[PDB]
Design a protein around this ligand. Sequence first.
Ligand code: NAP
Ligand code: HIK
Ligand code: CL
Length: 166
Amino acid sequence: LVPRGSHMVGLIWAQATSGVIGRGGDIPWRLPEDQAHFREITMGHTIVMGRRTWDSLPAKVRPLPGRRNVVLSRQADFMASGAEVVGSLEEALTSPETWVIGGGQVYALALPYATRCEVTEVDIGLPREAGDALAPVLDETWRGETGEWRFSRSGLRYRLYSYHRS
Ligand SMILES: NC(=O)c1ccc[n+]([C@@H]2O[C@H](COP(=O)([O-])OP(=O)(O)OC[C@H]3O[C@@H](n4cnc5c(N)ncnc54)[C@H](OP(=O)(O)O)[C@@H]3O)[C@@H](O)[C@H]2O)c1
Ligand SMILES: CCc1nc(N)nc(N)c1OCCCOc1ncccc1CCCO
Ligand SMILES: [Cl-]
């Protein structure tokens, strides 16, 4: 359970087996099971994203509904209609439960404060290319639960990981 006076920080992302999470300002696959899972985890909570992740969402769908949207930017004139723009993680992480929803820069930034990661791994062969956004690497202070491989309606294998630390 999450006490209302704490500040729990989780990370949630979907990656190829190579660790790629983003390419060319988008996610280089689509997996309905993953979007359903992302909604199930994050709904009702604050979500924190980097400015480039906000940019990657079509204007008509953002801010993502059912969640307090917070965007990280260092640009004093960047504005996110419907959402709050802050310049640091300290400003972004004031809710009792916060999910950092990407992208590569902000995962790495937020990991020192996080105690949970929820990962979808997609069994698509997407090798790392220069410029890609990548999943954060987790050191030995993390302990993980790896699900068995499942099969999506769209014909891709995928599996879920849950990582925790104190
Ligand atoms: N597969 C997934 O789970 C997943 C999830 C989310 C996103 N993505 C993909 O990942 C890519 C985006 O990731 P990215 O690494 O390029 O960018 P990002 O992490 O989404 O955003 C980077 C931006 O965040 C701001 N920022 C970074 N560090 C900051 C700090 N310390 N304080 C304040 N603001 C800070 C800066 O905005 P300013 O430049 O405005 O200062 C920076 O340009 C896209 O391809 C997207 O589609 C994938
Ligand atoms: C669903 C992708 C995802 N999956 C996991 N597991 N964790 C994340 N943090 C994550 O990204 C959430 C922010 C990027 O959302 C998208 N980006 C590109 C296309 C579609 C979407 C879905 C919102 C628009 O309907
Ligand atoms: Cl969503």
